[PDB]
PDB file of N, CA and C and ligand atoms in Angstrom:
ATOM      1  N   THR A   3      -4.646  16.592 -19.240  1.00  0.00           N
ATOM      2  CA  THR A   3      -4.835  15.129 -19.659  1.00  0.00           C
ATOM      3  C   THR A   3      -5.271  14.351 -18.702  1.00  0.00           C
ATOM      4  N   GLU A   4      -5.996  13.248 -18.833  1.00  0.00           N
ATOM      5  CA  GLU A   4      -6.226  12.114 -17.848  1.00  0.00           C
ATOM      6  C   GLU A   4      -5.096  11.459 -17.596  1.00  0.00           C
ATOM      7  N   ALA A   5      -5.092  10.766 -16.416  1.00  0.00           N
ATOM      8  CA  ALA A   5      -3.973   9.896 -15.924  1.00  0.00           C
ATOM      9  C   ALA A   5      -4.526   9.129 -14.556  1.00  0.00           C
ATOM     10  N   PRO A   6      -3.981   7.748 -14.760  1.00  0.00           N
ATOM     11  CA  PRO A   6      -4.208   6.992 -13.515  1.00  0.00           C
ATOM     12  C   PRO A   6      -3.196   7.395 -12.250  1.00  0.00           C
ATOM     13  N   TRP A   7      -3.588   6.892 -11.246  1.00  0.00           N
ATOM     14  CA  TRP A   7      -2.844   7.148  -9.905  1.00  0.00           C
ATOM     15  C   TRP A   7      -2.654   5.839  -9.245  1.00  0.00           C
ATOM     16  N   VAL A   8      -1.576   5.859  -8.336  1.00  0.00           N
ATOM     17  CA  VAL A   8      -1.253   4.629  -7.629  1.00  0.00           C
ATOM     18  C   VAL A   8      -1.069   5.005  -6.010  1.00  0.00           C
ATOM     19  N   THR A   9      -1.358   4.221  -5.181  1.00  0.00           N
ATOM     20  CA  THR A   9      -1.132   4.230  -3.876  1.00  0.00           C
ATOM     21  C   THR A   9       0.121   3.261  -3.503  1.00  0.00           C
ATOM     22  N   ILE A  10       1.102   4.209  -2.669  1.00  0.00           N
ATOM     23  CA  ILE A  10       2.349   3.529  -2.279  1.00  0.00           C
ATOM     24  C   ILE A  10       2.302   3.478  -0.705  1.00  0.00           C
ATOM     25  N   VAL A  11       2.704   2.150  -0.373  1.00  0.00           N
ATOM     26  CA  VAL A  11       3.058   2.086   1.082  1.00  0.00           C
ATOM     27  C   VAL A  11       4.402   2.221   1.439  1.00  0.00           C
ATOM     28  N   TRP A  12       4.857   2.789   2.482  1.00  0.00           N
ATOM     29  CA  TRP A  12       6.306   2.908   2.818  1.00  0.00           C
ATOM     30  C   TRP A  12       6.546   2.055   3.969  1.00  0.00           C
ATOM     31  N   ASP A  13       7.899   1.670   4.078  1.00  0.00           N
ATOM     32  CA  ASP A  13       8.318   0.932   5.240  1.00  0.00           C
ATOM     33  C   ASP A  13       8.318   1.826   6.658  1.00  0.00           C
ATOM     34  N   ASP A  14       7.969   1.373   7.678  1.00  0.00           N
ATOM     35  CA  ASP A  14       8.065   2.017   8.868  1.00  0.00           C
ATOM     36  C   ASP A  14       8.733   1.170  10.116  1.00  0.00           C
ATOM     37  N   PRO A  15       9.126   1.648  11.200  1.00  0.00           N
ATOM     38  CA  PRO A  15       9.824   0.890  12.047  1.00  0.00           C
ATOM     39  C   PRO A  15       8.984   0.231  13.174  1.00  0.00           C
ATOM     40  N   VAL A  16       7.755   0.401  13.260  1.00  0.00           N
ATOM     41  CA  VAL A  16       6.780  -0.005  14.186  1.00  0.00           C
ATOM     42  C   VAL A  16       6.045  -1.185  13.905  1.00  0.00           C
ATOM     43  N   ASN A  17       5.616  -1.275  12.691  1.00  0.00           N
ATOM     44  CA  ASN A  17       4.417  -2.267  12.425  1.00  0.00           C
ATOM     45  C   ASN A  17       5.116  -3.626  12.141  1.00  0.00           C
ATOM     46  N   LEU A  18       4.317  -4.685  12.477  1.00  0.00           N
ATOM     47  CA  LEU A  18       4.716  -6.099  12.199  1.00  0.00           C
ATOM     48  C   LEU A  18       4.572  -6.434  10.731  1.00  0.00           C
ATOM     49  N   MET A  19       5.413  -7.160  10.252  1.00  0.00           N
ATOM     50  CA  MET A  19       5.304  -7.650   8.745  1.00  0.00           C
ATOM     51  C   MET A  19       3.887  -8.589   8.775  1.00  0.00           C
ATOM     52  N   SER A  20       3.698  -9.244   9.790  1.00  0.00           N
ATOM     53  CA  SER A  20       2.367 -10.156   9.572  1.00  0.00           C
ATOM     54  C   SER A  20       1.273  -9.043   9.556  1.00  0.00           C
ATOM     55  N   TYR A  21       1.413  -8.106  10.401  1.00  0.00           N
ATOM     56  CA  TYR A  21       0.089  -7.118  10.147  1.00  0.00           C
ATOM     57  C   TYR A  21      -0.251  -6.607   8.956  1.00  0.00           C
ATOM     58  N   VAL A  22       0.932  -6.212   8.248  1.00  0.00           N
ATOM     59  CA  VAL A  22       0.759  -5.630   6.841  1.00  0.00           C
ATOM     60  C   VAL A  22       0.164  -6.451   5.928  1.00  0.00           C
ATOM     61  N   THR A  23       0.608  -7.813   6.044  1.00  0.00           N
ATOM     62  CA  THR A  23       0.171  -8.914   5.194  1.00  0.00           C
ATOM     63  C   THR A  23      -1.474  -8.936   5.331  1.00  0.00           C
ATOM     64  N   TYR A  24      -1.636  -8.945   6.496  1.00  0.00           N
ATOM     65  CA  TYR A  24      -3.212  -9.075   6.971  1.00  0.00           C
ATOM     66  C   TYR A  24      -4.047  -7.814   6.324  1.00  0.00           C
ATOM     67  N   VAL A  25      -3.354  -6.579   6.435  1.00  0.00           N
ATOM     68  CA  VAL A  25      -4.015  -5.529   6.123  1.00  0.00           C
ATOM     69  C   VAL A  25      -4.266  -5.471   4.817  1.00  0.00           C
ATOM     70  N   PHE A  26      -3.375  -5.780   3.915  1.00  0.00           N
ATOM     71  CA  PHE A  26      -3.467  -5.783   2.473  1.00  0.00           C
ATOM     72  C   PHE A  26      -4.584  -6.942   2.080  1.00  0.00           C
ATOM     73  N   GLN A  27      -4.589  -8.065   2.603  1.00  0.00           N
ATOM     74  CA  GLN A  27      -5.723  -8.901   2.428  1.00  0.00           C
ATOM     75  C   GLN A  27      -7.065  -8.347   2.782  1.00  0.00           C
ATOM     76  N   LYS A  28      -7.240  -7.675   4.017  1.00  0.00           N
ATOM     77  CA  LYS A  28      -8.423  -7.245   4.426  1.00  0.00           C
ATOM     78  C   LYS A  28      -8.900  -5.958   3.671  1.00  0.00           C
ATOM     79  N   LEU A  29      -7.945  -5.109   3.399  1.00  0.00           N
ATOM     80  CA  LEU A  29      -8.523  -3.814   2.690  1.00  0.00           C
ATOM     81  C   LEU A  29      -8.656  -4.032   1.251  1.00  0.00           C
ATOM     82  N   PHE A  30      -7.875  -4.881   0.636  1.00  0.00           N
ATOM     83  CA  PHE A  30      -7.983  -4.990  -0.779  1.00  0.00           C
ATOM     84  C   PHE A  30      -8.199  -6.230  -1.479  1.00  0.00           C
ATOM     85  N   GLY A  31      -8.657  -7.110  -0.677  1.00  0.00           N
ATOM     86  CA  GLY A  31      -8.914  -8.594  -0.978  1.00  0.00           C
ATOM     87  C   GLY A  31      -7.970  -9.286  -1.626  1.00  0.00           C
ATOM     88  N   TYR A  32      -6.851  -8.939  -1.320  1.00  0.00           N
ATOM     89  CA  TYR A  32      -5.623  -9.589  -2.191  1.00  0.00           C
ATOM     90  C   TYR A  32      -5.587 -10.950  -1.293  1.00  0.00           C
ATOM     91  N   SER A  33      -5.310 -12.063  -2.094  1.00  0.00           N
ATOM     92  CA  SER A  33      -4.654 -13.343  -1.812  1.00  0.00           C
ATOM     93  C   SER A  33      -3.529 -13.330  -0.895  1.00  0.00           C
ATOM     94  N   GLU A  34      -3.034 -14.363  -0.091  1.00  0.00           N
ATOM     95  CA  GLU A  34      -1.997 -14.426   0.918  1.00  0.00           C
ATOM     96  C   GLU A  34      -0.792 -14.216   0.050  1.00  0.00           C
ATOM     97  N   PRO A  35      -0.452 -14.968  -0.888  1.00  0.00           N
ATOM     98  CA  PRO A  35       0.797 -14.755  -1.871  1.00  0.00           C
ATOM     99  C   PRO A  35       0.929 -13.423  -2.174  1.00  0.00           C
ATOM    100  N   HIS A  36      -0.101 -12.729  -2.789  1.00  0.00           N
ATOM    101  CA  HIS A  36      -0.018 -11.356  -3.278  1.00  0.00           C
ATOM    102  C   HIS A  36       0.230 -10.458  -2.186  1.00  0.00           C
ATOM    103  N   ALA A  37      -0.384 -10.427  -1.174  1.00  0.00           N
ATOM    104  CA  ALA A  37      -0.113  -9.596   0.118  1.00  0.00           C
ATOM    105  C   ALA A  37       1.002  -9.730   0.632  1.00  0.00           C
ATOM    106  N   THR A  38       1.570 -10.852   0.811  1.00  0.00           N
ATOM    107  CA  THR A  38       2.927 -11.205   1.467  1.00  0.00           C
ATOM    108  C   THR A  38       4.167 -10.610   0.421  1.00  0.00           C
ATOM    109  N   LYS A  39       3.803 -10.964  -0.878  1.00  0.00           N
ATOM    110  CA  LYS A  39       4.757 -10.233  -1.852  1.00  0.00           C
ATOM    111  C   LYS A  39       4.746  -8.809  -1.833  1.00  0.00           C
ATOM    112  N   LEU A  40       3.780  -8.068  -1.797  1.00  0.00           N
ATOM    113  CA  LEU A  40       3.764  -6.660  -1.599  1.00  0.00           C
ATOM    114  C   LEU A  40       4.361  -6.211  -0.286  1.00  0.00           C
ATOM    115  N   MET A  41       4.047  -6.869   0.842  1.00  0.00           N
ATOM    116  CA  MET A  41       4.838  -6.527   2.145  1.00  0.00           C
ATOM    117  C   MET A  41       6.089  -6.615   1.927  1.00  0.00           C
ATOM    118  N   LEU A  42       6.613  -7.686   1.471  1.00  0.00           N
ATOM    119  CA  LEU A  42       8.258  -7.909   1.313  1.00  0.00           C
ATOM    120  C   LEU A  42       8.604  -6.868   0.342  1.00  0.00           C
ATOM    121  N   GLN A  43       8.076  -6.653  -0.728  1.00  0.00           N
ATOM    122  CA  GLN A  43       8.626  -5.575  -1.429  1.00  0.00           C
ATOM    123  C   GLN A  43       8.767  -4.248  -0.859  1.00  0.00           C
ATOM    124  N   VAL A  44       7.796  -3.758  -0.052  1.00  0.00           N
ATOM    125  CA  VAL A  44       8.026  -2.693   0.656  1.00  0.00           C
ATOM    126  C   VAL A  44       9.100  -2.733   1.767  1.00  0.00           C
ATOM    127  N   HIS A  45       9.279  -3.899   2.278  1.00  0.00           N
ATOM    128  CA  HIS A  45      10.201  -4.021   3.503  1.00  0.00           C
ATOM    129  C   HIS A  45      11.531  -4.087   2.856  1.00  0.00           C
ATOM    130  N   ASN A  46      11.653  -4.602   1.763  1.00  0.00           N
ATOM    131  CA  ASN A  46      12.991  -4.736   1.161  1.00  0.00           C
ATOM    132  C   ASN A  46      13.421  -3.578   0.303  1.00  0.00           C
ATOM    133  N   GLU A  47      12.536  -2.846  -0.356  1.00  0.00           N
ATOM    134  CA  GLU A  47      12.910  -1.817  -1.268  1.00  0.00           C
ATOM    135  C   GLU A  47      12.523  -0.591  -0.701  1.00  0.00           C
ATOM    136  N   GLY A  48      11.762  -0.515   0.679  1.00  0.00           N
ATOM    137  CA  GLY A  48      11.569   0.747   1.034  1.00  0.00           C
ATOM    138  C   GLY A  48      10.038   1.162   0.979  1.00  0.00           C
ATOM    139  N   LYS A  49       9.584   1.005  -0.249  1.00  0.00           N
ATOM    140  CA  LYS A  49       8.276   1.273  -0.691  1.00  0.00           C
ATOM    141  C   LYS A  49       7.750   0.473  -1.746  1.00  0.00           C
ATOM    142  N   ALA A  50       6.557   0.502  -2.130  1.00  0.00           N
ATOM    143  CA  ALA A  50       5.862  -0.516  -3.155  1.00  0.00           C
ATOM    144  C   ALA A  50       4.473   0.227  -3.496  1.00  0.00           C
ATOM    145  N   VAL A  51       4.179   0.097  -4.674  1.00  0.00           N
ATOM    146  CA  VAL A  51       2.878   0.492  -5.233  1.00  0.00           C
ATOM    147  C   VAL A  51       1.896  -0.861  -4.788  1.00  0.00           C
ATOM    148  N   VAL A  52       0.765  -0.390  -4.098  1.00  0.00           N
ATOM    149  CA  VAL A  52      -0.231  -1.457  -3.557  1.00  0.00           C
ATOM    150  C   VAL A  52      -1.509  -1.399  -4.421  1.00  0.00           C
ATOM    151  N   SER A  53      -1.828  -0.587  -5.136  1.00  0.00           N
ATOM    152  CA  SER A  53      -3.101  -0.396  -5.693  1.00  0.00           C
ATOM    153  C   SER A  53      -2.862   0.539  -6.801  1.00  0.00           C
ATOM    154  N   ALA A  54      -3.784   0.727  -7.679  1.00  0.00           N
ATOM    155  CA  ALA A  54      -3.863   1.608  -8.915  1.00  0.00           C
ATOM    156  C   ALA A  54      -5.432   2.068  -9.479  1.00  0.00           C
ATOM    157  N   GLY A  55      -5.400   3.050  -9.780  1.00  0.00           N
ATOM    158  CA  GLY A  55      -6.766   3.574 -10.351  1.00  0.00           C
ATOM    159  C   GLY A  55      -6.859   5.131 -10.427  1.00  0.00           C
ATOM    160  N   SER A  56      -8.189   5.481 -10.305  1.00  0.00           N
ATOM    161  CA  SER A  56      -8.390   6.896 -10.351  1.00  0.00           C
ATOM    162  C   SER A  56      -8.043   7.462  -9.095  1.00  0.00           C
ATOM    163  N   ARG A  57      -7.696   8.925  -9.372  1.00  0.00           N
ATOM    164  CA  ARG A  57      -7.150   9.809  -8.005  1.00  0.00           C
ATOM    165  C   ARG A  57      -8.186   9.618  -6.989  1.00  0.00           C
ATOM    166  N   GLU A  58      -9.490   9.532  -7.243  1.00  0.00           N
ATOM    167  CA  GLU A  58     -10.491   9.455  -6.246  1.00  0.00           C
ATOM    168  C   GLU A  58     -10.436   8.117  -5.552  1.00  0.00           C
ATOM    169  N   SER A  59     -10.148   7.161  -6.275  1.00  0.00           N
ATOM    170  CA  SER A  59     -10.162   5.647  -5.821  1.00  0.00           C
ATOM    171  C   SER A  59      -8.933   5.537  -4.954  1.00  0.00           C
ATOM    172  N   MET A  60      -7.717   6.218  -5.270  1.00  0.00           N
ATOM    173  CA  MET A  60      -6.497   6.058  -4.512  1.00  0.00           C
ATOM    174  C   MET A  60      -6.798   6.803  -3.228  1.00  0.00           C
ATOM    175  N   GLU A  61      -7.526   7.912  -3.277  1.00  0.00           N
ATOM    176  CA  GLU A  61      -7.648   8.824  -1.935  1.00  0.00           C
ATOM    177  C   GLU A  61      -8.330   7.936  -1.037  1.00  0.00           C
ATOM    178  N   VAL A  62      -9.366   6.909  -1.331  1.00  0.00           N
ATOM    179  CA  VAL A  62      -9.895   6.088  -0.344  1.00  0.00           C
ATOM    180  C   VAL A  62      -8.857   4.957   0.010  1.00  0.00           C
ATOM    181  N   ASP A  63      -8.047   4.668  -0.791  1.00  0.00           N
ATOM    182  CA  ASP A  63      -7.191   3.465  -0.400  1.00  0.00           C
ATOM    183  C   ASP A  63      -5.933   4.185   0.629  1.00  0.00           C
ATOM    184  N   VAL A  64      -5.524   5.377   0.392  1.00  0.00           N
ATOM    185  CA  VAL A  64      -4.760   5.925   1.315  1.00  0.00           C
ATOM    186  C   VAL A  64      -5.393   6.080   2.698  1.00  0.00           C
ATOM    187  N   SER A  65      -6.629   6.714   2.740  1.00  0.00           N
ATOM    188  CA  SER A  65      -7.404   6.868   3.893  1.00  0.00           C
ATOM    189  C   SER A  65      -7.542   5.357   4.796  1.00  0.00           C
ATOM    190  N   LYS A  66      -7.714   4.509   4.032  1.00  0.00           N
ATOM    191  CA  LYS A  66      -8.032   3.079   4.493  1.00  0.00           C
ATOM    192  C   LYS A  66      -6.628   2.649   5.356  1.00  0.00           C
ATOM    193  N   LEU A  67      -5.703   2.886   4.490  1.00  0.00           N
ATOM    194  CA  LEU A  67      -4.374   2.339   5.133  1.00  0.00           C
ATOM    195  C   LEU A  67      -3.775   3.075   6.195  1.00  0.00           C
ATOM    196  N   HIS A  68      -4.104   4.609   6.332  1.00  0.00           N
ATOM    197  CA  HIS A  68      -3.802   5.459   7.319  1.00  0.00           C
ATOM    198  C   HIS A  68      -4.627   5.064   8.521  1.00  0.00           C
ATOM    199  N   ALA A  69      -5.839   4.705   8.508  1.00  0.00           N
ATOM    200  CA  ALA A  69      -6.649   4.167   9.530  1.00  0.00           C
ATOM    201  C   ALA A  69      -6.045   2.829  10.306  1.00  0.00           C
ATOM    202  N   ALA A  70      -5.507   2.150   9.372  1.00  0.00           N
ATOM    203  CA  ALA A  70      -4.830   0.806   9.744  1.00  0.00           C
ATOM    204  C   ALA A  70      -3.503   1.104  10.395  1.00  0.00           C
ATOM    205  N   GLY A  71      -2.938   2.345  10.355  1.00  0.00           N
ATOM    206  CA  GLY A  71      -1.806   2.653  10.947  1.00  0.00           C
ATOM    207  C   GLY A  71      -0.485   2.547   9.937  1.00  0.00           C
ATOM    208  N   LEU A  72      -0.796   2.317   8.656  1.00  0.00           N
ATOM    209  CA  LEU A  72       0.464   2.349   7.699  1.00  0.00           C
ATOM    210  C   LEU A  72       0.765   3.570   7.033  1.00  0.00           C
ATOM    211  N   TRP A  73       1.866   3.661   6.609  1.00  0.00           N
ATOM    212  CA  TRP A  73       2.188   4.977   5.875  1.00  0.00           C
ATOM    213  C   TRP A  73       1.985   4.896   4.460  1.00  0.00           C
ATOM    214  N   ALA A  74       0.931   5.618   3.979  1.00  0.00           N
ATOM    215  CA  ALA A  74       0.476   5.665   2.579  1.00  0.00           C
ATOM    216  C   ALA A  74       0.459   6.875   2.042  1.00  0.00           C
ATOM    217  N   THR A  75       0.820   7.025   0.687  1.00  0.00           N
ATOM    218  CA  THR A  75       0.780   8.099  -0.183  1.00  0.00           C
ATOM    219  C   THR A  75       0.184   7.772  -1.534  1.00  0.00           C
ATOM    220  N   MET A  76      -0.193   8.932  -2.411  1.00  0.00           N
ATOM    221  CA  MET A  76      -0.503   8.532  -3.579  1.00  0.00           C
ATOM    222  C   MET A  76       0.103   9.652  -4.561  1.00  0.00           C
ATOM    223  N   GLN A  77       0.111   9.126  -5.853  1.00  0.00           N
ATOM    224  CA  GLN A  77       0.795  10.124  -6.943  1.00  0.00           C
ATOM    225  C   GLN A  77       0.379   9.333  -8.132  1.00  0.00           C
ATOM    226  N   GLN A  78       0.475  10.255  -9.243  1.00  0.00           N
ATOM    227  CA  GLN A  78       0.035  10.174 -10.705  1.00  0.00           C
ATOM    228  C   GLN A  78       1.047   9.000 -11.152  1.00  0.00           C
ATOM    229  N   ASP A  79       0.427   8.129 -12.048  1.00  0.00           N
ATOM    230  CA  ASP A  79       1.198   7.084 -12.576  1.00  0.00           C
ATOM    231  C   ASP A  79       1.815   7.631 -13.901  1.00  0.00           C
ATOM    232  N   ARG A  80       2.884   7.531 -14.233  1.00  0.00           N
ATOM    233  CA  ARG A  80       3.611   8.239 -15.446  1.00  0.00           C
ATOM    234  C   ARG A  80       4.074   7.119 -16.422  1.00  0.00           C
TER     235      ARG A  80
HETATM  236 MG1  LIG B 101       3.778   1.540   6.870  1.00  0.00          MG
HETATM  237 MG1  LIG B 102       4.210   3.637 -12.795  1.00  0.00          MG
HETATM  238 NI1  LIG B 103      11.692  -3.541   9.236  1.00  0.00          NI
END
């Protein structure tokens, strides 16, 4: 069966919170309040879904995030 996927960013001990907010705006076109909210969700919960779409589209988002130095994975949405 067909299924959509999500990209998840994970908290890490090195990166700056301000960097993550910028990366989400730059890579995804998100507004500042959206990017900051997602950043704080990852930082306070340990992880958060940052984007959603086809498996192929999430593969691109994971690669973009890895090149930025962020810990990203993808998984099917259930
Ligand atoms: Mg990270
Ligand atoms: Mg879900
Ligand atoms: Ni921290």
